[PDB]
Structure 1
Amino acid sequence: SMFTQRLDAAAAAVQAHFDKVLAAFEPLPIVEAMAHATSGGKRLRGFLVLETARLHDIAAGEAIWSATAIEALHAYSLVHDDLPCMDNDDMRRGQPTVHKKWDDATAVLAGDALQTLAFELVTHPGASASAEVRADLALSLARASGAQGMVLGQALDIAAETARAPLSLDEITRLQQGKTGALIGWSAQAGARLAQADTAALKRYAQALGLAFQIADDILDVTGDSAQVGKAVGKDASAGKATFVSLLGLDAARARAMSLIDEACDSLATYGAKADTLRETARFVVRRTH
């Protein structure tokens, strides 16, 4: 009840911050596309930033910059992933994708500008009184987002598409760690970085959470309803992809995801009960219907 309330409030706060910042830009189609691509979503990543910041006694009014930043980065990655030359999706978050509503060029550019906006948001002085902190947030964001992190993941996903054999569990795990793990890792570590505090516990938490999240996303592709998930389902099989469900089967995938909840929760022990919202987030990542 308290978890659900916090999540709803975080989503509202992130949306309000996007509405502020994007209303400062010129009212051109590319900016309208930026606003379209950043609306909606569960706000898992932003919520992680806000709740890890709360854990470390960082002001919400500062943490919102970093929470909006990671949502802008994540949104960019989806705008490009949905492109015809990529995964070619017509719908995202229950709405047409940017290239559908506008066109491919607008999607390329809107995505590009959203990546840039992520960096503007974390380096804005509001993000932290400490320039050490802002520089560190930006550096770690770039390393999480680029060709050692999320884009590496995207590249491995492409390699797989036409791999001679199907990937092993170890290969799809390394793929997951770039493709989804990196940005979730940045989000969870954010609060510790904001406080210049040790990131080890939250890094461990996120390693487990990110894997559970991906297993859940693979399960939604197989058993979910496009009306509730807001995107096409059955995609993975159509593309012949190894996924956690193809390798493990559904029962064992679900069970592995549940065991990862325990690992994520155990990682937080040093924080005590102040980390309970992060514990419930781990349960959410597996339970969720979308």
Structure 2
Amino acid sequence: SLSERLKEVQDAVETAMAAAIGRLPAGDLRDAMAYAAQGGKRLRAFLAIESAAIHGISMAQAMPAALAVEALHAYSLVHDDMPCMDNDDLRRGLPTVHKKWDDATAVLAGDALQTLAFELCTDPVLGSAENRVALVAALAQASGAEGMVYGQALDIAAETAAVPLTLDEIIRLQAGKTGALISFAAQAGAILAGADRGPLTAYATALGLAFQIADDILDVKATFVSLLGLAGAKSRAADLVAEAEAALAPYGEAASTLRACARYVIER
């Protein structure tokens, strides 16, 4: 059951995240962080826990990694919603951090949520120091100027430009903006097991692009719908989900929960 499993992960992450932030000193900065990290479908946390499971690793052992990726995701949104960025008053129908506190508080809460993500990677519950440093390196690659921040920067620049982006450009944007962090989550189980990262990386590359394509289809400047056509976007998204499922053939029947997740990304 993907839905039940998804629900179990959401509930476990919500409780754990609350606690993690709770031990920080009191104040507007902690409340803002706590608020930003509350809720969400928890896709990334799910991929970390699920990919750990495939390598026989418990949720309790995997949790700090799940927390770190949700923390990193949360901070990215806190900043992206800001006026000079995407300028969103609402996130899932509730006021954004910068609206509920101010712009200064949103800068600071996202800054500390990124710091929190990295701190979480150091928790010895995760396992050997060797796997933990590989975890930090992988998070940093995905989140920084080669991954997440780079694709945000491409996307901010795209929002202005009076020449729409090409397919090759929007693919590069999406690989960093969205693709990179999902790939971190998917590989996190392999990192913690000291195992081949290959299949989960390939899975994630396909899943990440299906994810963004699906977003665009529901969303009705170049998009996957404007570039590929509506039926063309839908067909691409389904072909990438099949590519993602095929990437997990090494794992046999144990890949079925991850195969279902890829299908879920586009089944809306």
For Structure 1 versus Structure 2, the TM-score category normalised by the shorter chain is over 0.9
**Aligned position for 2:239:** 259
Aligned partner of 1:115: which letter? Q
Question: How much does 1:27 deviate?
Answer: 2.2
Q: Which runs of 4+ in 1 moved over 2 A?
A: 161-164
Any residues of structure 2 matched to 1:9-24 within 5 Å, and which? 9-24=8-23
**Aligned position for 2:99:** 100
Q: 1:121–1:127: 8 Å Cα contact kept in structure 2?
A: no
Q: Give the Cα separation in 1 of the matches to 2:178 and 2:30.
A: 26
Greater shift in the superposed pair: 162-171 or 186-195: 162-171
Residue 193 of structure 1 is aligned with which of 191, 197, 203?
191
**Aligned position for 2:78:** 79
| CA deviation map 1:219-240 (0-9, x unaligned) | 2222xxxxxxxxxxxxxxxxxx
Residue 178 of structure 2 is aligned with which of 177, 180, 184?
180
**Aligned position for 1:133:** 131
- Among the aligned pairs, what percent are the same residue? 63
Q: 1:40–1:93: 8 Å Cα contact kept in structure 2?
A: no
Q: Please give the TM-score of this superposition, normalised by the length of structure 1.
A: 0.91
Question: How much does 1:17 deviate?
Answer: 0.9
Greater shift in the superposed pair: 22-31 or 148-157: 22-31
Secondary structure of the corresponding residue to residue 162 of structure 1: coil
What count of residue pairs does the alignment treat as equivalent? 268
Structure 2: segments with no counterpart, 5+ residues? none
Q: Give the Cα separation in 1 of the matches to 2:70 and 2:108.
A: 17
**Aligned position for 1:210:** 208
Any residues of structure 2 matched to 1:1-290 within 5 Å, and which? 2-128=1-127, 130-222=128-220, 241-288=221-268
Question: How much does 1:94 deviate?
Answer: 2.4
| CA deviation map 1:25-70 (0-9, x unaligned) | 1221111111111111110000000000000011211100000100
Q: Give the Cα separation in 1 of the matches to 2:18 and 2:153.
A: 32
Structure 1: segments with no counterpart, 5+ residues? 223-240
Secondary structure of the corresponding residue to residue 39 of structure 2: coil
| CA deviation map 1:175-229 (0-9, x unaligned) | 100000000000001100110101111100000000000011112222xxxxxxx
Q: Please give the TM-score of this superposition, normalised by the length of structure 2.
A: 0.98
| CA deviation map 1:59-83 (0-9, x unaligned) | 2111000001000000000000000
Q: Give the Cα separation in 2 of the matches to 1:270 and 1:155.
A: 36
| CA deviation map 1:149-186 (0-9, x unaligned) | 00000111122223341111111001100000000000
